[PDB]
Scaffold this active site. Structure first.
Site, PDB file in Angstrom:
ATOM      1  N   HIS A  75       0.922  -1.200   0.093  1.00 45.20           N
ATOM      2  CA  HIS A  75      -0.051   0.050  -0.056  1.00 45.20           C
ATOM      3  C   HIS A  75       0.804   1.194  -0.181  1.00 45.20           C
ATOM      4  CE1 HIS A  75       0.880   0.276   4.275  1.00 45.20           C
ATOM      5  NE2 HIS A  75       0.003   1.202   4.651  1.00 45.20           N
ATOM      6  N   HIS A  77       1.392   3.881   2.112  1.00 42.26           N
ATOM      7  CA  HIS A  77       2.321   4.470   3.188  1.00 42.26           C
ATOM      8  C   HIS A  77       3.594   4.274   3.247  1.00 42.26           C
ATOM      9  CE1 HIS A  77      -1.848   4.585   5.553  1.00 42.26           C
ATOM     10  NE2 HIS A  77      -1.817   5.807   4.938  1.00 42.26           N
ATOM     11  N   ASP A  79       5.442   3.111   5.316  1.00 40.55           N
ATOM     12  CA  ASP A  79       6.086   1.969   5.939  1.00 40.55           C
ATOM     13  C   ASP A  79       5.921   0.666   4.910  1.00 40.55           C
ATOM     14  OD1 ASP A  79       3.368   1.535   5.799  1.00 40.55           O
ATOM     15  OD2 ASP A  79       3.083   0.358   7.881  1.00 40.55           O
ATOM     16  N   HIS A 137      -7.695  -1.030   5.058  1.00 43.25           N
ATOM     17  CA  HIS A 137      -6.672  -0.107   5.873  1.00 43.25           C
ATOM     18  C   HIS A 137      -6.611   1.308   4.922  1.00 43.25           C
ATOM     19  CE1 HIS A 137      -2.985   1.730   7.948  1.00 43.25           C
ATOM     20  NE2 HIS A 137      -2.634   1.406   6.565  1.00 43.25           N
ATOM     21  N   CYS A 156      -0.817  -4.113   5.905  1.00 45.18           N
ATOM     22  CA  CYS A 156      -1.692  -3.417   7.014  1.00 45.18           C
ATOM     23  C   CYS A 156      -2.901  -3.699   7.005  1.00 45.18           C
ATOM     24  CB  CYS A 156      -1.316  -1.884   6.837  1.00 45.18           C
ATOM     25  SG  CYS A 156       0.427  -1.471   6.877  1.00 45.18           S
ATOM     26  N   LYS A 159      -5.251  -7.190  10.780  1.00 46.16           N
ATOM     27  CA  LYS A 159      -5.252  -6.222  12.008  1.00 46.16           C
ATOM     28  C   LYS A 159      -6.111  -6.998  13.075  1.00 46.16           C
ATOM     29  CE  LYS A 159      -3.106  -2.721  10.848  1.00 46.16           C
ATOM     30  NZ  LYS A 159      -3.695  -1.576  10.093  1.00 46.16           N
ATOM     31  N   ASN A 165      -3.883   2.772  12.358  1.00 44.09           N
ATOM     32  CA  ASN A 165      -4.236   3.959  12.047  1.00 44.09           C
ATOM     33  C   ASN A 165      -5.186   3.980  10.940  1.00 44.09           C
ATOM     34  OD1 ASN A 165      -4.164   6.527  10.702  1.00 44.09           O
ATOM     35  ND2 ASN A 165      -2.520   5.667   9.047  1.00 44.09           N
ATOM     36  N   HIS A 195       2.090  -5.205  11.455  1.00 43.84           N
ATOM     37  CA  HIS A 195       2.420  -4.564  12.643  1.00 43.84           C
ATOM     38  C   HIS A 195       2.258  -5.521  13.889  1.00 43.84           C
ATOM     39  CE1 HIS A 195       3.290  -0.945  10.263  1.00 43.84           C
ATOM     40  NE2 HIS A 195       1.842  -0.785  10.183  1.00 43.84           N
TER      41      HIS A 195
HETATM   42  O1  LIG Z   1       0.534   1.458   7.775  1.00 43.43           O
HETATM   43  C1  LIG Z   1       0.119   2.593   8.590  1.00 43.43           C
HETATM   44  O2  LIG Z   1      -0.502   3.468   8.245  1.00 43.43           O
HETATM   45  C2  LIG Z   1       0.568   2.446  10.234  1.00 43.43           C
HETATM   46  C3  LIG Z   1       1.472   3.339  10.626  1.00 43.43           C
HETATM   47  C4  LIG Z   1       1.766   3.483  11.899  1.00 43.43           C
HETATM   48  C5  LIG Z   1       0.978   2.489  12.894  1.00 43.43           C
HETATM   49  C6  LIG Z   1      -0.050   1.546  12.313  1.00 43.43           C
HETATM   50  N1  LIG Z   1      -0.643   0.705  13.068  1.00 43.43           N
HETATM   51  C7  LIG Z   1      -0.923   0.991  14.455  1.00 43.43           C
HETATM   52  C8  LIG Z   1      -1.588  -0.266  14.904  1.00 43.43           C
HETATM   53  C9  LIG Z   1      -2.140  -0.564  16.407  1.00 43.43           C
HETATM   54  C10 LIG Z   1      -0.826  -0.375  17.240  1.00 43.43           C
HETATM   55  C11 LIG Z   1      -0.881  -0.066  18.784  1.00 43.43           C
HETATM   56  C12 LIG Z   1       0.090  -0.117  19.389  1.00 43.43           C
HETATM   57  C13 LIG Z   1       1.450  -0.230  19.234  1.00 43.43           C
HETATM   58  C14 LIG Z   1       1.645  -0.859  17.747  1.00 43.43           C
HETATM   59  C15 LIG Z   1       0.488  -0.803  16.733  1.00 43.43           C
HETATM   60  N2  LIG Z   1      -1.644  -1.117  13.936  1.00 43.43           N
HETATM   61  N3  LIG Z   1      -1.077  -0.387  12.955  1.00 43.43           N
HETATM   62  C16 LIG Z   1      -0.213   1.787  11.061  1.00 43.43           C
HETATM   63  C17 LIG Z   1      -1.186   0.929  10.420  1.00 43.43           C
HETATM   64  O3  LIG Z   1      -2.359   0.841  10.718  1.00 43.43           O
HETATM   65  O4  LIG Z   1      -1.094  -0.059   9.570  1.00 43.43           O
HETATM   66 ZN   LIG Z   2      -0.821   1.936   6.217  1.00 46.59          ZN
HETATM   67 ZN   LIG Z   3       1.182  -0.238   8.590  1.00 46.86          ZN
END
Ligand SMILES: O=C(O)c1cccc(-n2cc(Cc3ccccc3)nn2)c1C(=O)O
Ligand SMILES: [Zn+2]
Ligand SMILES: [Zn+2]
Length: 219
Positions: A75, A77, A79, A137, A156, A159, A165, A195
């Site tokens: 995707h 983003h 990351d 996402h 991403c 989940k 996010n 993640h």
């Molecule tokens: O891909 C993205 O947009 C992204 C960027 C940064 C974080 C991201 N995320 C966050 C979480 C929940 C979480 C809570 C606590 C610790 C670690 C993760 N899951 N992904 C994302 C994303 O949603 O992929």
């Molecule tokens: Zn993302």
């Molecule tokens: Zn991500």
């Protein structure tokens, strides 16, 4: 301060790379991606957050006798795409869907030198397939299926314990997208999220559960 890039074997010919980045609100975020060996050639499934980490990833496999023949970003983003610019400067073919590169263009970011369209695309025939399950996402998120290993890189999209996010998420389509993904790849042996930890096919159920929940709590 942040932990170092990490490369672990997952299966024959399949490694998980994990890079780390401080994002505000999430703290230190792990990002899993893959490297897939097809004969003597390496394919990146997503780039690390950064150029520096992307270069360490590349030299790790070049050191070991593998040339990098391509990367695909799941995707738009950073990351998933943070190292595309660095790869382009080294003449390494980068791939991203037409929509993904469109979204990169609109964000002022560097685009992959190759694109694909359609719901399905072979990066390497019968080895590395790309599939679009619908928005979730992000509008453009895609998964990567490895048919000989039954490994699905969900990126991403997958989940299981929270949707993360939601800035560019489509929370209304995500449940339909997740249900399609769950039926198609229900025989996956491993499922790799961006993640969260690697799991089995139950991560597809849990991802569905979180998307339905997320939709209801928005009403
Ligand atoms: O891909 C993205 O947009 C992204 C960027 C940064 C974080 C991201 N995320 C966050 C979480 C929940 C979480 C809570 C606590 C610790 C670690 C993760 N899951 N992904 C994302 C994303 O949603 O992929
Ligand atoms: Zn993302
Ligand atoms: Zn991500």
């Amino acid at each position: 301060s942040l932990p170092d890039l990490k490369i672990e074997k997952l299966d024959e010919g399949v490694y998980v790379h994990t890079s780390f980045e401080e994002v505000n609100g999430w703290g230190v975020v792990p990002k899993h991606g893959l490297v897939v060996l097809v004969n003597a050639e390496a394919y990146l499934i997503d780039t690390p957050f950064t150029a520096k980490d992307t270069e360490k990833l590349v030299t790790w496999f070049v050191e070991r006798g593998y040339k990098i023949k391509g990367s695909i970003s799941s995707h738009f983003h950073s990351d998933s795409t943070g190292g595309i610019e660095w790869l382009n400067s080294r003449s390494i073919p980068t791939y991203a869907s037409e929509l993904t590169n469109e979204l990169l263009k609109k964000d002022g970011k560097v685009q992959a030198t190759n694109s694909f369209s359609g719901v399905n695309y072979w990066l390497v025939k019968n080895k590395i397939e790309v599939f679009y399950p619908g928005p979730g996402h992000t509008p453009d998120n895609v998964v990567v299926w490895l048919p000989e290993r039954k490994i699905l890189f969900g990126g991403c999209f997958i989940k299981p314990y929270g949707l993360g996010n939601l800035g560019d998420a489509n929370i209304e389509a995500w449940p339909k997208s997740a249900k399609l993904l769950k039926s198609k790849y229900g025989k996956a042996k491993l499922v790799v999220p961006s993640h969260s930890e690697v799991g089995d096919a139950s991560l597809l159920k849990l991802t569905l559960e979180q998307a339905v929940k997320g939709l209801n709590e928005s009403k």
